[PDB]
Amino acid sequence: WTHLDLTSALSVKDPTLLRIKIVPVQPFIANSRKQLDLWASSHLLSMLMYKALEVIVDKFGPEHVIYPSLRDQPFFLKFYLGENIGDEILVANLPNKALAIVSGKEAEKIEEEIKKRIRDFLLQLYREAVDWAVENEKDSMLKEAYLKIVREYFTVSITWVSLYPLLVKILDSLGERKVTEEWKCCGENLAIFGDMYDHDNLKSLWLDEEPLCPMCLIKRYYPVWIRSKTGQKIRFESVVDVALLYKNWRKIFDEKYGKDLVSKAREVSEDFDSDLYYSSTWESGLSKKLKNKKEIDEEKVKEVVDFLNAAYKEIGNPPKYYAILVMDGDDMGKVISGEVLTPQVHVAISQALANFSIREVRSVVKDEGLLIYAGGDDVLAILPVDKALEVAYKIRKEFGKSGWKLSAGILIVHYKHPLYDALEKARDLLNNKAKNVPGKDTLAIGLLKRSGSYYISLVGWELIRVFYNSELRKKLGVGKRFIYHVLREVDTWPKVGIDEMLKFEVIRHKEETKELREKIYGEIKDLLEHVRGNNEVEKVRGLFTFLKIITDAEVFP
């Protein structure tokens, strides 16, 4: 049906191919402290691309935008059509790069019109935010040297060509040239330091002891702006909120106990957050959460610990690790753009990516963890430790049927760990580890224990398939004895040899305990073909590190 869509925009108007791209993406995102900051920043990025797109839509129509496909785009439904949209709207699913069919004469003004609208809105927000941080100097907070940072920050490169998949190729590399040619938290002047202030005097002024620049102020305000433009806010506020979803711990906790813990936490103070389900925090600190010079009863603390600890002996210890899942398509730069072909095929692909990202990835994540972003062939999610692998694979299969292949970094991490770093490492797994294998179609799973230890393992998607249905998974104590032993041998390498090492080790860990040993060796061998590695030592290392991680009793209690 999208042929008769293009015939219009191609015939009805004197047609010129316009292209949008907002430049600060991976930076703006990684500069975030708490999970909310990461959602807020990525979501806004989408907001911008929406206001960029809004202009195209307003002046013309939706079918004039090739990429992304605007059918089912939750922002538009909610915002442009005033549809009564549900929690869909919390997920950011518009990417930066875009492609529209524009009328030759508008091409010039549409460029400046997009530029203004972004600035206008960001400014519009900075203000609204300025008011909010006052609610919870303030005249000269809107100096036209701070206004600058806001307008100057996000760069929106816009380019066009008249009327071939070659024109598309010429539009991209022409476009990808204007890009580069066009403290707080982050290399940007703080909203007070840039004029004349001491760093001691600076920190004192700011609401949480950390001084913010204008951009990061917009980050903080956005979650309340959204709550009052749409209805709702992120379901899992903290990283800890998603960490406590491991084997329904929180839900189980919020029945047997929960009311009594709330009660217990009322009579210590008014902590009316999630950290407090951990015994550790009640001993470890609380000082920080004391925003007032009031008194804290100590028996209440001592016997909040006792309550929780006894809770833990009847329920299990509370989960303290969570997953960062980042995903990205392979060999698809030139597919999204259309060089590898505009015919309706380029729309078809756009619709395929739109559909996957909006519906299929959400149906996979599905209140079982936080889907921050799905731009077509790329995903950010915070997951519980026991959903990471399961979600990743599920999503991979789906992107299968809807481009072709897709890699992934998963970073399991202790909750108390700096996000900026965690987010950085997860990215690195995906880009520097995963995407650098020959047949780049791989899971790069990493585990960083609070110890400082950092196990990584690079794996084919087929491995998780084989491993579920594996006899080997069925037993993993015996496992603790097995895996550690193997990993020890392959710390350097078994001088005995790799094959004979596994035999002796499978052998070591009455009618059926011959066929069983013989089955495991087979699987263990089968599995290695799916570990990405350049020799059996690397492959063995790789599998038994995947084994090591999946089974770790501190991460998976």
Whichever of 213 and 335 has its CB closer to Zn ion, that residue is 213
Q: Which part of the chain contacts Zn ion (CB under 5 A), choosing from 96-104, 163-171, 177-185, 459-467? A: 177-185
Whichever of 186 and 261 has its CB closer to Zn ion, that residue is 186
* Residue 139 to residues 130, 143, 203, 219, Cα–Cα distance (Å): 10, 8, 19, 21
- Which residue in this structure is represented by tokens 């380029």? 346
Whichever of 37 and 536 has its CB closer to Zn ion, that residue is 37
129 binds Zn ion (CB under 5 A): no
- CA-to-CA distance for 417 and 359, rounded, in angstroms? 32
- Secondary structure of 394-434 in HEC code, one letter for each residue: HHHHHHHHCCCCEEEEEEEEECCCCHHHHHHHHHHHHHHHH
Instruction: Consult the annotation and say whether 106 binds a ligand.
Output: no
Site residues for Zn ion, 477-506, by CB under 5 A, read none
Instruction: Consult the annotation and say whether 314 binds a ligand.
Output: no
Helix (H) or strand (E) holding 375: none
Residues 6+ apart with CB under 8 A from 336: 67, 97, 349, 350, 353, 376, 377
Whichever of 206 and 455 has its CB closer to Zn ion, that residue is 206
Instruction: Consult the annotation and say whether 398 binds a ligand.
Output: yes
Instruction: Consult the annotation and say whether 378 binds a ligand.
Output: yes
Contact 245, 384 (CB under 8 A): yes
Q: Identify the residue among 114, 130, 185, 456 touching Zn ion (CB under 5 A).
A: 185
Shortest distance in whole angstroms from residue 536 CB to Zn ion:
48
Instruction: Consult the annotation and say whether 213 binds a ligand.
Output: yes
Report residue 138 as tokens.
Answer: 């303030």
391 binds Zn ion (CB under 5 A): no
Contact 539, 526 (CB under 8 A): no
Angle (CA) 38-258-36 rounded to 5° is 5
Instruction: Consult the annotation and say whether 554 binds a ligand.
Output: no
Shortest distance in whole angstroms from residue 148 CB to Zn ion:
14
Instruction: Consult the annotation and say whether 489 binds a ligand.
Output: no
Q: Tell the burial category of 58 from Cβ atoms under 10 Å away from its Cβ (0-12, 13-18, 19+).
A: exposed
Shortest distance in whole angstroms from residue 133 CB to Zn ion:
14
Shortest distance in whole angstroms from residue 24 CB to Zn ion:
12
Shortest distance in whole angstroms from residue 219 CB to Zn ion:
8
Shortest distance in whole angstroms from residue 529 CB to Zn ion:
47
Task: Give the contact letters, 199-228, x = binds to Zn ion (CB under 5 A), - = no.
Answer: --------------x--x------------
186 binds Zn ion (CB under 5 A): yes
Whichever of 103 and 189 has its CB closer to Zn ion, that residue is 189
184 binds Zn ion (CB under 5 A): yes
Angle (CA) 85-58-172 rounded to 5° is 100
Q: Which part of the chain contacts Zn ion (CB under 5 A), choosing from 180-188, 258-266, 291-299, 486-494? A: 180-188
Site residues for Zn ion, 336-365, by CB under 5 A, read none
> Total binding residues for Zn ion by CB under 5 A?
5
Whichever of 90 and 185 has its CB closer to Zn ion, that residue is 185
Sign of CA pseudo-dihedral 358, 231, 391, 453: positive
Long-range Cβ pairs for the range 531-536 (8 Å, 24+): 531/457, 531/458, 531/459, 531/460, 531/463, 532/437, 532/442, 532/458, 532/459, 532/460, 533/458, 536/498, 536/499
Report residue 224 as tokens.
Answer: 């309340």
Q: Which part of the chain contacts Zn ion (CB under 5 A), choosing from 181-189, 234-242, 320-328, 425-433? A: 181-189
Shortest distance in whole angstroms from residue 216 CB to Zn ion:
3
Q: Nearest to residue 502, comparing CAs of 520, 515, 514?
A: 520
Whichever of 185 and 456 has its CB closer to Zn ion, that residue is 185
Is the preceding omega at residue 68 within 30 degrees of 0, hence cis?
yes
Residues 6+ apart with CB under 8 A from 111: 158
Annotated binding site for Zn(2+): 185-186, 213, 216
Annotated binding site: 185-186, 213, 216, 328, 360, 377-378, 398
Q: What are the residues binding Zn ion (CB under 5 A)?
A: 184-186, 213, 216
Annotated binding site for Mn(2+): 328, 360, 377-378, 398
